[PDB]
């Protein structure tokens, strides 16, 4: 059965028509209370070019380069790379591979880098001559999707009865913990069975059920259907749409809203197809704390304790590896 995933024209969130912004907020509210997914359309980002530049990267990087960029899970020499870098495939065992990068403003002179604060790292990049234009393209993409995400956060805020900068004031270029992951799901013949997981209902999967570790997740994927969302009605297929961004809440949103906006449980079906999954995880700053609330209660009070974003994030990232494995 197909999940209800509405297409929402988010362009008013970039402008000054406040009533039009409220009508978008209502759609976000409805989707958030239903399956928890929607497609953002009329978002302004050139996703075809994103896909093409990502393809050029994934198909030309070499094994040597992958070792040289590898996170510490794959390369013991890179002890500072917990988040940022290359996540290698393991032919015959693990099909997916990916490249993660963080805020380009996390430079060696950034105060959180100097302090060695958890979850902050300086990005690693391949050689420019081997991948001309890639670093520059990827850094600008970070800021293009940052901008889209800021507009979406205005929509969420309004949807929850707040002023539009409720979330966005904690989402800032100098300190956001947001990440881009460029994931390659390959076509393989034969496809290794160890890379295929099986759900309790029999569905072959590439990644097991989870909630995202994010405030919201802003995802581009190729036009190959693969995601499913759990609803009271069972797991439902999310249709692909390679012209839109698939949006959903992460568990920090669920905490902040006392589950009024749940972090939907979702999973990735196994498909033997060469495709791309390019999430942007919208994370706040390390010390950002928003007081939890509950938009279902007249006084809006919640019995949840405030949680800093950095505490959330550090704990969540490890937990997800422990539950569904090292990606
Ligand atoms: C379904 C997803 C988009 S979300 C799910 C899974 N998510 C993660 O591993 C989180 C990675 C966070 C990142 N390294 C960081 O440091 O910020 C992943 O990747 N999966 C994607 C996929 O498999 O397509
Ligand atoms: Fe996810």
From Swiss-Prot:
Keywords: Antibiotic biosynthesis, Cytoplasm, Iron, Metal-binding, Oxidoreductase, Vitamin C
Cofactor section: Fe(2+)
Secretion signal, residue range per the UniProt entry: none
Pathway membership: Antibiotic biosynthesis; penicillin G biosynthesis; penicillin G from L-alpha-aminoadipate and L-cysteine and L-valine: step 2/3
Cofactor note: Binds 1 Fe(2+) ion per subunit.
Feature type site, description Transition state stabilizer: 207
Binding residues annotated for N-[(5S)-5-amino-5-carboxypentanoyl]-L-cysteinyl-D-valine, in chain numbering: 83, 87, 179, 185, 210, 212, 277
Gene Ontology annotations of biological process type: penicillin biosynthetic process
GO molecular-function terms, A-Z: iron ion binding; isopenicillin-N synthase activity; L-ascorbic acid binding
Predominant location: cytoplasm
EC number: 1.21.3.1
Result when mutating residue 268 to T: Strongly reduced the catalytic activity
Record-listed 2-oxoglutarate binding positions: 275
Subunit details: Monomer.
Family: Belongs to the iron/ascorbate-dependent oxidoreductase family.
Function recorded in the entry: Isopenicillin N synthase; part of the gene cluster that mediates the biosynthesis of penicillin, the world's most important antibiotic. IpnA catalyzes the cyclization of the tripeptide N-[(5S)-5-amino-5-carboxypentanoyl]-L-cysteinyl-D-valine (LLD-ACV or ACV) to form isopenicillin N (IPN) that contains the beta-lactam nucleus. The penicillin biosynthesis occurs via 3 enzymatic steps, the first corresponding to the production of the tripeptide N-[(5S)-5-amino-5-carboxypentanoyl]-L-cysteinyl-D-valine (LLD-ACV or ACV) by the NRPS acvA.
Protein name: Isopenicillin N synthase
Taxonomic classification: Eukaryota, Fungi, Dikarya, Ascomycota, Pezizomycotina
Name of the gene encoding the protein in the UniProt record: ipnA
């Amino acid at each position: 059965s197909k999940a209800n995933v509405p297409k929402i024209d988010v362009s008013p969130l970039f402008g000054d028509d406040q009533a039009a912004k409220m009508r978008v907020a209502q759609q976000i509210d409805a989707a958030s209370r239903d399956t928890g997914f929607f497609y953002a359309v009329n978002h302004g980002i050139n996703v075809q070019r994103l896909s093409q530049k990502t393809k050029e990267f994934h198909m030309s990087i070499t094994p040597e380069e992958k070792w040289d960029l590898a996170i510490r899970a794959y390369n013991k020499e890179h002890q500072d790379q917990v988040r940022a870098g290359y996540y290698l495939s393991i032919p015959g065992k693990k099909a997916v591979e990916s490249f993660c990068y963080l805020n380009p403003n996390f430079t060696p002179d950034h105060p959180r880098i100097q302090a060695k604060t958890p979850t902050h790292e300086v990005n690693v990049w391949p050689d420019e001559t081997k991948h001309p234009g890639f670093q520059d393209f990827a850094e600008q993409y970070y800021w293009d999707v940052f901008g889209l995400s800021s507009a979406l956060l205005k929509g969420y805020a309004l949807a929850l009865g707040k002023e539009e900068n409720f979330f966005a004031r904690h989402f800032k270029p100098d300190d956001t913990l947001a990440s881009v992951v460029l994931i390659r799901y390959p076509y393989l013949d034969p496809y290794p069975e160890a890379a295929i997981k099986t759900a309790a209902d029999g569905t072959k999967l590439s990644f097991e059920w989870h909630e995202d570790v994010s405030l919201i997740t802003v995802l581009y994927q190729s036009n190959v259907q693969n995601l499913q969302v759990e609803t009271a009605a069972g797991y439902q297929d999310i249709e692909a749409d390679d012209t839109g961004y698939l949006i959903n809440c992460g568990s920090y949103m669920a905490h902040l809203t006392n589950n009024y906006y749940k972090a939907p449980i979702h999973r990735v079906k196994w498909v033997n197809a060469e495709r791309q999954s390019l999430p942007f995880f919208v994370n706040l700053g390390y010390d950002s704390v928003i007081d939890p609330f509950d938009p279902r209660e007249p006084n809006g009070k919640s019995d949840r304790e405030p949680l800093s974003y950095g505490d959330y994030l550090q704990n969540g990232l490890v937990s997800l590896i422990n539950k569904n494995g090292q990606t």
